[PDB]
Amino acid sequence: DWGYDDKNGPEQWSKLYPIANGNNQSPVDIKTSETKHDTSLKPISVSYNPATAKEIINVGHSFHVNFEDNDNRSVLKGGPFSDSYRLFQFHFHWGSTNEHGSEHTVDGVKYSAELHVAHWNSAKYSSLAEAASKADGLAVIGVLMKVGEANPKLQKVLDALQAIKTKGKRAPFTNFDPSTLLPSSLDFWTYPGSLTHPPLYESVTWIICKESISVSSEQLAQFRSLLSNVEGDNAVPMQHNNRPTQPLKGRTVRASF
């Protein structure tokens, strides 16, 4: 079973997932002196229906908030896309201390956490399963989370975690629009990349927001107090789940700004 421990963690993933050492791996360090302003990039447009929010789940290495993805009620458009992308999930990554925890870095700076809002190409493909095997199948919005003031927009999410404390627990999570978590500016970087954990498929168009959102030290502690163990076992806190940055291998990061 893959994880983030020394034995099952990012450094070992290449043994069952050799794409780990591929040419389009994520995350990356965004060097602002090497980005290329692209005039053809349209603004990002999100239109999410809060009725598509379904369920929150403890998946052992992280937690996921899933959405109903049977129709186009909740869609991403614009940016580098011709196609509409259908929201299916959001989740976070964090680190063992405030010093690190983001997956993407900007000019070598590490943030405390990172929000991923994940979508699949419903213009071209008819399921997440089909879309995840395609170079153009997935679109993920990444938002860097900078330790500081408590973020009240996180409140429904953090309040839900006490019902999913241990691995495999799940609960209804309804009437939530995750566009409320995005920063006020949607200026972005984009590059072609991958899932940041197994199976590490090179199927993702990344959209990284230049503006951070806030999170308090105590809000991060709530993520780290989730348990990776099943109920009844010895408590094993979910201390971290961020992958180190990977080589660009000649990819261009483009800037909308």
Ligand X SMILES: Cc1ccc(-c2nc(SCC(=O)Nc3ccc(S(N)(=O)=O)cc3)nc(O)c2C#N)cc1
- Binding residues are 61, 64, 91, 93, 116, 196-197
Q: Show contacts with ligand X in window 7-46 (CB under 6 A).
A: none
Cβ 161 to ligand X, closest distance in Å?
19
Bridge partners for 40 per DSSP: none
Inter-residue contact 24 to 55 (CB < 8 Å): no
- 40's CB contacts (< 8 A; 6+ apart) are none
Between 150 and 249, name the residue whose CB sits nearer to ligand X: 249
118 contacts ligand X (rule: CB under 6 A): yes
Q: Omega into 27 within 30° of 0, i.e. cis?
A: yes
Bridge partners for 4 per DSSP: none
Size of the site for ligand X (CB under 6 A): 11
Active site amino acids: 61
Query: Quick count: other Cβ atoms within 10 Å of Cβ 85?
Result: 29
51: tokens are 């009725």
Helices (H), 24-144: 128-131
The single residue among 54, 104, 116, 254 that binds ligand X, judged by CB under 6 A, is: 116
132 contacts ligand X (rule: CB under 6 A): yes
Between 40 and 198, name the residue whose CB sits nearer to ligand X: 198
119 contacts Zn ion (rule: CB under 5 A): no
Cβ 143 to ligand X, closest distance in Å?
12
CA dist list (Å): 164 to 39, 55, 108? 44, 11, 34
Bridge partners for 120 per DSSP: 86, 138
Q: Which does 132 bind (CB under 5 to 8 A by kind): Zn ion, ligand X, none?
A: ligand X
Q: Tell how strand 254-255 and strand 36-37 pair up.
A: parallel
Closest residue to ligand X, Cβ-based? Answer: 116
205 contacts ligand X (rule: CB under 6 A): no
Residues placed in the known binding site for Zn(2+): 61, 64, 91, 93, 116, 197
Between 54 and 116, name the residue whose CB sits nearer to ligand X: 116
198 contacts ligand X (rule: CB under 6 A): yes
What gap in Å lies between CA 76 and CA 45, rounded to an integer?
Answer: 6
Q: CA-CA-CA-CA torsion for 176, 181, 186, 188, nearest 10 degrees?
A: -110
| Contacting range for ligand X; rule: CB under 6 A; set: 29-37, 179-187, 195-203, 247-255 | 195-203
| Contacting range for ligand X; rule: CB under 6 A; set: 76-84, 104-112, 182-190, 192-200 | 192-200
Helices (H), the chain: 128-131, 155-160, 217-224
The residue ranges that bind ligand X (CB under 6 A) are: 116, 118, 132, 138, 140, 195-199, 204
The residue ranges that bind Zn ion (CB under 5 A) are: 116
